[PDB]
């Protein structure tokens, strides 16, 4: 049958109260299976269902290293959005990213996702074609031009079409 | 691509000296990198930055320190220059995917 | 090692065809690049592969072919010139956070 995998990453800035809170949650079909929260004592990716215990410590280690990077991506890009939208560095703001893959009954890709939201509004999304982008406003248009010149679409497409699908089946087999 | 510039281009340092290598990029790139190349062959990563305030230990960070005070400047400090730190040093920037290198900083260490 | 260049040096006649072999063991999604380093210079981007057409074109009449089945990103120039003499580096992205370079192949072009 059809299946899906989705990751949701959000970061909320804490004006003069420390660094942004970074959370990431994975979903297989529509159920949470993995989670990372920067606010933890020892922040690392954690199995949210018992069948994810099957993955060895290398898996968790490697996956945790990605989160650390993402956290850094979020702090910087939060500050650049303050720039585009001409806001003060004293207010709370939120940047969200969601990506993943839907597979068809034949196991192959049905739809890939890679999209971003700022303060609860759409920012930029990869279209279903996995070649073009939809920009919600003036500011996201800046990102669209940059991304069109730098081959961003082909970069995300590589992950969405291959690894994302392969790990989905990997998790399904564990389940 | 020619928007990354390093300073100095050529140095002869003395052992124990504090040596600061400077990098400026006007590519509006968030990611900056310091590699070193000894053999005219492999480039090994020392330190990198995800943006202002970010500093990340590479594969061989020992004896080095880095500073990213702003988006355009990423400096590499040798606290106390040692002969083993003799190398060609390359700064790079990236906005995702590909990286763009500077022309290089030839660093020689004199034991006097 | 994430990328392997099996030949340290290669010699070809002017106007002949060049193949530079590259192999990767990177298990995740391979983002691949070829860089050219001219003497006393920083490495310059030739071409890259993210996805799509596995045959990609670079600057200076360079092309490379991605092959998943052979885990390779071999480089080609149909007709080499005297000035192609330089060191060539294969590179693979480390989870999109920076580049990991191969050991590099030195190309010597024998003039007519």
């Amino acid at each position: 049958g059809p299946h899906s995998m989705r990751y949701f990453e959000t970061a909320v800035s804490r004006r003069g109260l420390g660094e942004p809170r970074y959370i990431s949650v994975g979903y297989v079909d529509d159920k949470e299976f993995v989670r990372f929260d920067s606010d933890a004592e020892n922040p690392r990716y954690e199995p949210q269902v018992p069948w994810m215990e099957q993955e060895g410590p290398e898996y968790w280690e490697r996956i945790t290293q990605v989160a650390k990077g993402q956290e850094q991506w979020f702090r910087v890009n939060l500050r650049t959005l303050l720039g585009y939208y001409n806001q003060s560095a004293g207010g709370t703001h939120t940047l969200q990213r969601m990506y993943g893959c839907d597979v068809g009954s034949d196991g192959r890709l049905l739809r890939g996702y890679e999209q971003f939201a700022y303060d609860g509004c759409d920012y930029i999304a990869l279209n279903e074609d996995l070649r073009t982008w939809t920009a919600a406003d003036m500011a996201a248009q800046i990102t669209r031009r940059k991304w069109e010149q730098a081959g961003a679409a082909e970069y995300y497409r590589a992950y969405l079409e291959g690894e994302c699908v392969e790990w989905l089946h990997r998790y399904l087999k564990n389940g | 691509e020619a928007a990354v510039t390093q300073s100095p281009r050529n140095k002869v340092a003395v052992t124990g000296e504090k040596v600061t290598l400077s990098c400026n990029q006007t590519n509006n790139h968030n990611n900056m990198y310091w590699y070193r190349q000894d053999t005219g062959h492999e480039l090994r990563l020392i330190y990198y930055s995800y943006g202002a305030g970010s500093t990340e230990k590479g594969d061989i960070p020992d004896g080095y320190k880095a500073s990213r005070p702003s988006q355009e400047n990423f400096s590499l400090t040798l606290e106390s220059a040692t002969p083993s730190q003799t190398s060609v040093y390359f700064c790079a920037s990236g906005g995702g995917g590909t990286l763009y290198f500077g022309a290089g900083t030839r660093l020689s260490v004199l034991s006097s | 090692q994430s990328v392997t260049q099996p030949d340290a040096r290669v010699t070809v006649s002017e106007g002949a065809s060049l193949q530079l072999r590259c192999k990767y063991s990177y298990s995740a999604t391979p983002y691949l690049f070829w860089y050219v380093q001219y003497p006393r210079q920083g490495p310059q981007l030739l071409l890259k592969y993210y996805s799509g057409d596995p045959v990609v074109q670079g600057v200076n009449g360079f092309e490379a072919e991605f092959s998943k089945s052979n885990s390779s990103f071999h480089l080609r120039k149909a007709s080499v010139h005297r000035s192609d003499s330089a060191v060539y580096f294969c590179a693979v992205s480390h989870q999109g956070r920076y580049l990991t370079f191969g050991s590099g192949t030195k190309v010597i072009v024998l003039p007519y």
Binding site: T80, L81, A150, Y156, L160 | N30, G95 | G96
Partner: peptide
Amino acid sequence: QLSPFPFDL
């Protein structure tokens, strides 16, 4: 395995 590091906004 997760998506690689995203491009600059």
